[PDB]
Coordinates of C-alpha atoms (C1' of nucleotides) and ligand atoms in Angstrom, one line a residue:
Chain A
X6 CA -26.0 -86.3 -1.1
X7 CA -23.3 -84.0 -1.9
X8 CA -21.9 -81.4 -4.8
X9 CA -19.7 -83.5 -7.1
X10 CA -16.8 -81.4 -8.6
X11 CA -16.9 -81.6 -12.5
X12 CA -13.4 -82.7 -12.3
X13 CA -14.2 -85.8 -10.6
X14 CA -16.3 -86.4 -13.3
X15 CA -13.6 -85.8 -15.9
X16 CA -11.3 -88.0 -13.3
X17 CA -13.7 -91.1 -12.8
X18 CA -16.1 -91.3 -15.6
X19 CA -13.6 -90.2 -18.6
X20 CA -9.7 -90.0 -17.4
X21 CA -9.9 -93.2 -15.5
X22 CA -12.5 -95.4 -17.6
X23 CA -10.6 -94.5 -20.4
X24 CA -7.0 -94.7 -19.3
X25 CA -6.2 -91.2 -20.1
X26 CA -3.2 -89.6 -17.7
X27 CA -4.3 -85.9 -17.4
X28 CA -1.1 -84.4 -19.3
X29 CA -1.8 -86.9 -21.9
X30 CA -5.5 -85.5 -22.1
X31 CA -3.6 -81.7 -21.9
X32 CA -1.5 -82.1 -25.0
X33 CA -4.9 -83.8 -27.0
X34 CA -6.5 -81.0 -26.1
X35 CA -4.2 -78.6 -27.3
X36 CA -3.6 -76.8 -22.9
X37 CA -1.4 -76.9 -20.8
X38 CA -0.8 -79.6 -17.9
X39 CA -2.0 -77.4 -14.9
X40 CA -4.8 -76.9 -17.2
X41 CA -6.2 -80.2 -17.0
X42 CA -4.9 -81.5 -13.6
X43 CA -6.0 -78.5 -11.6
X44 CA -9.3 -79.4 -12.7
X45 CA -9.2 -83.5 -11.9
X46 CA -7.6 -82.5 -8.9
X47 CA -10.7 -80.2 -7.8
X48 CA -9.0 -76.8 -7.3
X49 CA -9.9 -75.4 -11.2
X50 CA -13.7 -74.9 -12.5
X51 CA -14.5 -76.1 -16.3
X52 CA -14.3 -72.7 -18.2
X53 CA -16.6 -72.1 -20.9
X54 CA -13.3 -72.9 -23.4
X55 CA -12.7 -75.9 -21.6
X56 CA -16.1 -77.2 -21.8
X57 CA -16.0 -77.0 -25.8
X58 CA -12.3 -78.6 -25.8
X59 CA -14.0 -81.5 -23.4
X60 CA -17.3 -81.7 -25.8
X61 CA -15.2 -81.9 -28.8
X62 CA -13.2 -84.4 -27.7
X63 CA -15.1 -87.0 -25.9
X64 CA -17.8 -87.0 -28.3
X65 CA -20.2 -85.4 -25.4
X66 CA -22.2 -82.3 -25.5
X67 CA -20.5 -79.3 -24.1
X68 CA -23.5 -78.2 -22.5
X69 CA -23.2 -80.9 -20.1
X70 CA -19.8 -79.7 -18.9
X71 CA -21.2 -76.3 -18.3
X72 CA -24.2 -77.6 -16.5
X73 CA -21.7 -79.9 -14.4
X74 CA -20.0 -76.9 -13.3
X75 CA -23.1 -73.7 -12.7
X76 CA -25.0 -76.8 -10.2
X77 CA -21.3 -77.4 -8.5
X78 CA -21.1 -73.1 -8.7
X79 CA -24.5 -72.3 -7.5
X80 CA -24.2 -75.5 -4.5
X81 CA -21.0 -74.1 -3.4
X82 CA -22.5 -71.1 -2.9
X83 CA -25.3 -71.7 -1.3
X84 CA -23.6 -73.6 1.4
X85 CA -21.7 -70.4 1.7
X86 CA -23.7 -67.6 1.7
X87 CA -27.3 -69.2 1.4
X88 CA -28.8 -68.9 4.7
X89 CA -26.9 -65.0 4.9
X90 CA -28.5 -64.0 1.9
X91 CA -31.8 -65.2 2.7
X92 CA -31.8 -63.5 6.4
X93 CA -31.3 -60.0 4.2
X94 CA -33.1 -60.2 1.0
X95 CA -37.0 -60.1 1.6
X96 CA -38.9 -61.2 -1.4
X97 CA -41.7 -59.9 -3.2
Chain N
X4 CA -34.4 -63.9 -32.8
X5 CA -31.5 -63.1 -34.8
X6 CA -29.5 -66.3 -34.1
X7 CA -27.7 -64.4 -31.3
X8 CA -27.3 -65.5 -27.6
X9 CA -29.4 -63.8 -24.8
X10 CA -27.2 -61.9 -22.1
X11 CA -29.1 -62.6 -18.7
X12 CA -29.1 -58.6 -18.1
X13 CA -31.7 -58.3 -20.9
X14 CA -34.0 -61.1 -19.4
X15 CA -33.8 -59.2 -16.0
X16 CA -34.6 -56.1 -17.9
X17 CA -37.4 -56.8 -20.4
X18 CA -39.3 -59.3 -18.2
X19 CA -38.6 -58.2 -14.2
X20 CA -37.4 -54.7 -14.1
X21 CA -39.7 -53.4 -16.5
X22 CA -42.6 -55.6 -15.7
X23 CA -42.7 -54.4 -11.8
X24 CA -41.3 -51.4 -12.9
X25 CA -38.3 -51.3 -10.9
X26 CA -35.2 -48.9 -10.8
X27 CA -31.7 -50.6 -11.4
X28 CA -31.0 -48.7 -8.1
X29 CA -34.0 -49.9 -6.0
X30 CA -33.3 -53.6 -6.8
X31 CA -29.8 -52.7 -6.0
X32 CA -31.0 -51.7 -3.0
X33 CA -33.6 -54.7 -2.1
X34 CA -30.8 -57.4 -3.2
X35 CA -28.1 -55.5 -0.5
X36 CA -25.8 -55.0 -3.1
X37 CA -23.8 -52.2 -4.5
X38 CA -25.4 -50.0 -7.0
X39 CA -22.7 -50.5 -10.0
X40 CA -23.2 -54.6 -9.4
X41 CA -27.0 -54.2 -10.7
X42 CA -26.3 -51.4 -13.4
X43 CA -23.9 -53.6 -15.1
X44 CA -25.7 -56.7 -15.2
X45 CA -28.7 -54.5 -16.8
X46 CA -26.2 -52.8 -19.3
X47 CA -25.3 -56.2 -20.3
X48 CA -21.5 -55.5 -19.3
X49 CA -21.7 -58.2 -16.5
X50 CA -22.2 -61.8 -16.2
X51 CA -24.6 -63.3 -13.3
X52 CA -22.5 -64.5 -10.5
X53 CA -23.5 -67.3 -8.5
X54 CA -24.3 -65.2 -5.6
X55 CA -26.2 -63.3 -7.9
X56 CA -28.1 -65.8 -9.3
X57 CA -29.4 -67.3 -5.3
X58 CA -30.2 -63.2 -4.8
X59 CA -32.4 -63.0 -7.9
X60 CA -34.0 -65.9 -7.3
X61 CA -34.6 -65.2 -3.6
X62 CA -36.1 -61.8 -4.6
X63 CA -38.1 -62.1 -7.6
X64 CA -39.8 -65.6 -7.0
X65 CA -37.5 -67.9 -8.9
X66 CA -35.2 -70.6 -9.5
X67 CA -31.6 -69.6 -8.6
X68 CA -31.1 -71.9 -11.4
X69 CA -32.7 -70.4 -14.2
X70 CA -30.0 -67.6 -13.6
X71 CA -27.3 -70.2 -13.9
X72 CA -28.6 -71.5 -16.7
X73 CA -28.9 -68.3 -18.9
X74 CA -25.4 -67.3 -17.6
X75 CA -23.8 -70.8 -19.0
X76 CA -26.2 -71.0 -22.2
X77 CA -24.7 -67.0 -23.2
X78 CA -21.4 -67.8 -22.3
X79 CA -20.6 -71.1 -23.7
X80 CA -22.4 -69.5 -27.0
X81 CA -19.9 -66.6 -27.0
X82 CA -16.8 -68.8 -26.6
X83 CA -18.3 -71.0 -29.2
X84 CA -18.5 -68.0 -31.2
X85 CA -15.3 -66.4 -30.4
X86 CA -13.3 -69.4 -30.7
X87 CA -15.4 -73.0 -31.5
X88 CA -14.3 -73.0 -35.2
X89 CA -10.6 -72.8 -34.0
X90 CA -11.3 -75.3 -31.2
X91 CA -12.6 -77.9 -33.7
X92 CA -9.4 -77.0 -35.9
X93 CA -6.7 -78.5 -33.8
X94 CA -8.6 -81.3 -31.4
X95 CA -9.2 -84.4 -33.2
X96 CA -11.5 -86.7 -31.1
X97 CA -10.3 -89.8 -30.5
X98 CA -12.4 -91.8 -32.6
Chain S
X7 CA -3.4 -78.5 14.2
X8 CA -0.9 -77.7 12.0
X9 CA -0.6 -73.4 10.9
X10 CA -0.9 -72.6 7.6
X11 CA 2.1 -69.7 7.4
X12 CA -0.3 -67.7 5.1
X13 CA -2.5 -67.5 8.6
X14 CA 0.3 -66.1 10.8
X15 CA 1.0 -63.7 8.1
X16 CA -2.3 -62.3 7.7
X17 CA -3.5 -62.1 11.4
X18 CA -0.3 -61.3 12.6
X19 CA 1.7 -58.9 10.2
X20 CA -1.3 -57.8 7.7
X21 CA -3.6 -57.3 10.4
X22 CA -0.9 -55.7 13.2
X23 CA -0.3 -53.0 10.5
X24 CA -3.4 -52.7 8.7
X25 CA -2.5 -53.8 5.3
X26 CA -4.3 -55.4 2.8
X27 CA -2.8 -58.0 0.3
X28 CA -2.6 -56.0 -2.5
X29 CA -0.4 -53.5 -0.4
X30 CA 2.3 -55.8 0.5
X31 CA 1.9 -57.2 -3.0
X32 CA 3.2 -53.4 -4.4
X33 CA 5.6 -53.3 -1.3
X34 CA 7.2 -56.8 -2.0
X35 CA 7.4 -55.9 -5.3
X36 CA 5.7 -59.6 -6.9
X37 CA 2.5 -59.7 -8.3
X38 CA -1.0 -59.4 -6.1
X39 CA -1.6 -63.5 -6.6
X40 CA 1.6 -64.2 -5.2
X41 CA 0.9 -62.3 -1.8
X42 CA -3.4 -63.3 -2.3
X43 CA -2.7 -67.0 -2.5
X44 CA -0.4 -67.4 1.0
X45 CA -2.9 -64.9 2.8
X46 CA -5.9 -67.0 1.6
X47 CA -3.8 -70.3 2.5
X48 CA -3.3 -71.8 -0.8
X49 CA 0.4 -71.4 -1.5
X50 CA 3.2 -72.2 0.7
X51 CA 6.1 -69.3 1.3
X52 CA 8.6 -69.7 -1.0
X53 CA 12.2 -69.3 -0.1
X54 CA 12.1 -65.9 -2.4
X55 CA 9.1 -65.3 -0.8
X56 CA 10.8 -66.0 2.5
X57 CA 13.3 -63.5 1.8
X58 CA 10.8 -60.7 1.1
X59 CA 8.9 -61.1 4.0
X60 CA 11.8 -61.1 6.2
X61 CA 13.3 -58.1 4.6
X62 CA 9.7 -55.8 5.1
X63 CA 9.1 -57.3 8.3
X64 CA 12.8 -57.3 9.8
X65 CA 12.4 -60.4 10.4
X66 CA 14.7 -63.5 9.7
X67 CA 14.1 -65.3 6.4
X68 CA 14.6 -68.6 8.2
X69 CA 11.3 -67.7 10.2
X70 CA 9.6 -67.5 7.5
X71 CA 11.1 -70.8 6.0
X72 CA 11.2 -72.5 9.7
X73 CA 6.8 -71.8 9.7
X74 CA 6.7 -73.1 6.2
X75 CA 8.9 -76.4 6.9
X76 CA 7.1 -77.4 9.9
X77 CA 3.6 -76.6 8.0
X78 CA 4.6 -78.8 5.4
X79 CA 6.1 -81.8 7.3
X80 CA 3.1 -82.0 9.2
X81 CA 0.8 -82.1 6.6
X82 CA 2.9 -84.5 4.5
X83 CA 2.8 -86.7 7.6
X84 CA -1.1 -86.6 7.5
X85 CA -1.3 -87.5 4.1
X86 CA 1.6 -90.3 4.3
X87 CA 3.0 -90.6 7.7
X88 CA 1.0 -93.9 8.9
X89 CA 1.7 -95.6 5.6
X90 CA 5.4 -94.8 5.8
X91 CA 5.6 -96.0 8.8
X92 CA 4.1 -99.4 8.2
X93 CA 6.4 -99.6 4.8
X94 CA 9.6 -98.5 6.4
X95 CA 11.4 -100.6 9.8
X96 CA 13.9 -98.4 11.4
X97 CA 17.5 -99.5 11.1
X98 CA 16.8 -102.1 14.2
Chain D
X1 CA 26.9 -73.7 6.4
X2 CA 30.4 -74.6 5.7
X3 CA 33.0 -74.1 8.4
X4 CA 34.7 -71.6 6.0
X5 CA 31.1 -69.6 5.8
X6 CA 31.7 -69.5 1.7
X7 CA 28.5 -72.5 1.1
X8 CA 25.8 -73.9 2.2
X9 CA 25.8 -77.6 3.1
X10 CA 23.3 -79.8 1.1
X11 CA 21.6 -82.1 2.9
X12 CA 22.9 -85.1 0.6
X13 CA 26.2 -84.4 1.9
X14 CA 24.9 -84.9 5.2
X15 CA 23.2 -88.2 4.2
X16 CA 26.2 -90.1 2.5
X17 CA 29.0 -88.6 5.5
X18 CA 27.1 -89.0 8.3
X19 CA 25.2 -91.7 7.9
X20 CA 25.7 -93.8 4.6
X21 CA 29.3 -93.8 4.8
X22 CA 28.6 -94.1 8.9
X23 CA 26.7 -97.0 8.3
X24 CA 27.8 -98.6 5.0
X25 CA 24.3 -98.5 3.2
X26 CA 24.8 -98.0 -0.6
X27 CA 21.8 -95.6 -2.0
X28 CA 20.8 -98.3 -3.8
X29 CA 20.1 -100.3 -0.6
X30 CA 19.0 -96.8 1.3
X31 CA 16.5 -97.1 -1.8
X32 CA 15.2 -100.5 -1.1
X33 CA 14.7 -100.0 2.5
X34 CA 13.0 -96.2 2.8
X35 CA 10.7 -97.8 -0.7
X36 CA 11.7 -95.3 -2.8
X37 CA 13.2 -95.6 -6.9
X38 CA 17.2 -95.6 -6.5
X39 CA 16.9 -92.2 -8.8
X40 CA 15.5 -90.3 -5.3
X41 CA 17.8 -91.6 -2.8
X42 CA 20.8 -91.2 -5.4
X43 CA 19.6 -87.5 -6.8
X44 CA 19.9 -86.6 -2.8
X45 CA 23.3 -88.4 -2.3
X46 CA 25.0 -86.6 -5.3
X47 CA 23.2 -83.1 -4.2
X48 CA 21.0 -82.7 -7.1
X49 CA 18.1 -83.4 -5.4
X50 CA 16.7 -81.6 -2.3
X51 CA 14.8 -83.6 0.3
X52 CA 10.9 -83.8 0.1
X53 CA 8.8 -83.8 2.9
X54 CA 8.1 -87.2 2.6
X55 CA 11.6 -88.2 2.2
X56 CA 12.1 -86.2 5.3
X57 CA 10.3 -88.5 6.8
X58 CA 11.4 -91.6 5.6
X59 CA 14.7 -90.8 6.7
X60 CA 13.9 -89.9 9.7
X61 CA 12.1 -93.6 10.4
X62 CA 14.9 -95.8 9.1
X63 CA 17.7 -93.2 11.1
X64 CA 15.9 -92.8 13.9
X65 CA 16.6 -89.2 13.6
X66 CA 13.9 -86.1 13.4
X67 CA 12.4 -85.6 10.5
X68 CA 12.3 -81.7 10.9
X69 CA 16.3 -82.1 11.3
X70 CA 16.1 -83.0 7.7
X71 CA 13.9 -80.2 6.8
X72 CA 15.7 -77.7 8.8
X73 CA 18.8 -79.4 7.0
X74 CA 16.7 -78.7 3.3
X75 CA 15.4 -75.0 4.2
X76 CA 18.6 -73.1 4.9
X77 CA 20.4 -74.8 2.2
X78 CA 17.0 -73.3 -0.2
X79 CA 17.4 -70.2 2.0
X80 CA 20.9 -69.9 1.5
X81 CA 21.2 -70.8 -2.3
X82 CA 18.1 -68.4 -3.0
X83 CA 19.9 -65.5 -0.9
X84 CA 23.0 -65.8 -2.7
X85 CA 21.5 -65.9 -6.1
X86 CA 18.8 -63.3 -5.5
X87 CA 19.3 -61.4 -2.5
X88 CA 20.5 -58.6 -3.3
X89 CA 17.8 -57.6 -6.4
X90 CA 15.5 -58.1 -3.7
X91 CA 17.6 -55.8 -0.7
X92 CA 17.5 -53.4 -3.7
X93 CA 13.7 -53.2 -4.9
X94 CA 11.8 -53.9 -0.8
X95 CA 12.2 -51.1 1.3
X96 CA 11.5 -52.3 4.9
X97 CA 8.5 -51.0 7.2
Chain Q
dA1 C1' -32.7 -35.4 -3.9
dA2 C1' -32.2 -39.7 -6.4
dG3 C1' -30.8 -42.8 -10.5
dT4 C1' -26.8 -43.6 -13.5
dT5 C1' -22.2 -44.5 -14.5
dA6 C1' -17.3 -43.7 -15.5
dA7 C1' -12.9 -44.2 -12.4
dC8 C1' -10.3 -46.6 -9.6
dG9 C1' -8.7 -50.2 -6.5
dC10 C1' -9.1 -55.0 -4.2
dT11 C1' -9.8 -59.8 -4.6
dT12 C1' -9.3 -63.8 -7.1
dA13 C1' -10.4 -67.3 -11.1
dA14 C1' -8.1 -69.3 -15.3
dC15 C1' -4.1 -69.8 -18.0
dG16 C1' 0.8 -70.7 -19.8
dT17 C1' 5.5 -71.0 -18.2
dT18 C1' 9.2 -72.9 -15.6
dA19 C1' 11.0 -75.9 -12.7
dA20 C1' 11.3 -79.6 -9.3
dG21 C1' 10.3 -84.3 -7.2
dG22 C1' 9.2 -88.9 -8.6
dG23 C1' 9.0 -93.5 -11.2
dT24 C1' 10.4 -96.1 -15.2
dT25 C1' 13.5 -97.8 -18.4
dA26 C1' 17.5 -98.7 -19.9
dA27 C1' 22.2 -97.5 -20.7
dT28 C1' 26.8 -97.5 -18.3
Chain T
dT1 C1' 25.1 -109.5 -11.7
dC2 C1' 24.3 -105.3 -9.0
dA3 C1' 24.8 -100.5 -8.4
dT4 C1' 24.8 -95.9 -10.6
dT5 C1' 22.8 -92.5 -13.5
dA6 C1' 20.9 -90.7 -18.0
dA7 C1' 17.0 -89.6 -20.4
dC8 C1' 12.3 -89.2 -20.4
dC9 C1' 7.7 -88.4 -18.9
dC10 C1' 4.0 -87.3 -15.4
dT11 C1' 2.3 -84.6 -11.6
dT12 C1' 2.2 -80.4 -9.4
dA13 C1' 4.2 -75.8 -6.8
dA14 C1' 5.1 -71.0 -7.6
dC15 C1' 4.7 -67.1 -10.5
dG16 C1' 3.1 -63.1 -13.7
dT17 C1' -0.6 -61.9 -16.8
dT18 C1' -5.2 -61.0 -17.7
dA19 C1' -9.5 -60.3 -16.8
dA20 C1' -13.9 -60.7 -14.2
dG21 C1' -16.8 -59.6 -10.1
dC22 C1' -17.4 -56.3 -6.5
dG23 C1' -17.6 -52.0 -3.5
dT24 C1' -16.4 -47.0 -2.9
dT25 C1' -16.2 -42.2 -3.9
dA26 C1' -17.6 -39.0 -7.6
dA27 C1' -19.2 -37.1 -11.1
dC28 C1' -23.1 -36.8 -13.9
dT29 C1' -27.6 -36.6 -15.0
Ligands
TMP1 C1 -33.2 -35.7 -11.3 C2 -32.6 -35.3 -12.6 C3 -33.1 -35.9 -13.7 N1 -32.6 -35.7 -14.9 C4 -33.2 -36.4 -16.1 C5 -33.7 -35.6 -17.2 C6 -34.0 -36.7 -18.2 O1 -35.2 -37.4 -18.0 C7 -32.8 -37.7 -18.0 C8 -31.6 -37.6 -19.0 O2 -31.5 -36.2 -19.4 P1 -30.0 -35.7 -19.9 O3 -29.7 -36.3 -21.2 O4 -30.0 -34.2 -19.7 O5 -32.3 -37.3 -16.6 C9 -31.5 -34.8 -15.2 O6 -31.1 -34.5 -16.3 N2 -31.1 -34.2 -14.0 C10 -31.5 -34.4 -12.7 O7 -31.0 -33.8 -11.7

DNA sequence: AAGTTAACGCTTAACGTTAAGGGTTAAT
DNA sequence: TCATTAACCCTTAACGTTAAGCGTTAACT
């Protein structure tokens, strides 16, 4: 009933379950602290890097991180330019 | 298939451009967007952005999420490639 | 509600002069970012940034400081103010 | 500002003169009351530490003072401590409208 | 004329760096 | 004991760098 940031994913279902501080999680996966805490905090997307640094280390597919992200991408804008871009793009 | 990742711009090519026939600059055109922003995607020298992605869908009949999903598919496949061997080096994975 | 000083420098400098962000970014001498991120609200005025402003504007610095104090006490107070004030009894 | 116009005043030398020393509060017992560690309220007290919005605000509770006197207090000592180390680089490289 | 594209500038994501505010711990 | 403060880490603001997406104006077909 909403788009879920990845990064609350990464907060809730990984950070949080497995008692992980984010700059610990930054210096196991070999980034800097922004890095990982813009992201938990919700103000950073998973790059494609990331998402192989996050597979890699959590066992999890890296695929999922990506897909996490392009559905929060593609809902975000939607909400943003949907209705716009439907009013001026007949289809075929 | 060579075992190499497919860049979006040659699925808009080879199976909607060329199978309604249409003009880089006509779907440029039809998606009210700048003629350079089609081109590139076409000459593979672009990724699809998410406001590309709802456009193409909108216009040619199909998910907005197929487009996403190529997009991610190529691009996590590049970074693998570019950089996955050196990614696995020096993360160990708690376990 | 409480003005972000990003706003009152894009509607009323940028916009008074006709300049876009990446003009006063060349003109303040900092990178475009640093200019992009206070016009698109997401990054307070620094006091260096404070200066630069108030020398191309001939304005004061402390305006510039004054808009970005007030913006962040307020907000500060929405995040924490009703908790600190249930935590803290004033000195009788 | 100083009376002799040379410095800035930090707000931590407003906080222990005015109103610790005023009061006779150690930091350590400011600490207690505004619920922060005794590191903050003693970083502000011995000027290494400029004050937070928040602690703004906590102050400004337990003094019954403003809190924007504290940040008005904060912002020209920042204003004045980045002039002096920077101001005229920037003077030099921004030419004004 | 109309489609392509190479140039150029604007906006803005992601990233490492640096530094500051904060709590904790423990030393003084 | 009790207050001060050192040393250390975590979170996070500001900044330059880099690069990506985009539109515009021109060259080119
Ligand atoms: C309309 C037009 C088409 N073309 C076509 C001819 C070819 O089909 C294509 C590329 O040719 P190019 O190589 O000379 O472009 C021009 O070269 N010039 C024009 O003005």
């Amino acid at each position: 009933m909403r788009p879920i940031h990845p990064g609350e994913i990464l907060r809730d279902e990984f950070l949080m379950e497995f008692d992980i501080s984010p700059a610990a999680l930054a210096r196991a996966l070999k980034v800097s602290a922004p890095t990982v805490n813009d992201i938990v905090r919700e103000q950073r997307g998973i790059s494609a890097d990331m998402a192989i640094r996050l597979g890699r280390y959590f066992d999890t597919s890296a695929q999922f991180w990506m897909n996490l992200q392009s559905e929060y991408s593609l809902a975000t804008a939607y909400a943003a330019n949907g209705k716009q871009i439907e009013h001026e793009i007949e289809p075929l």
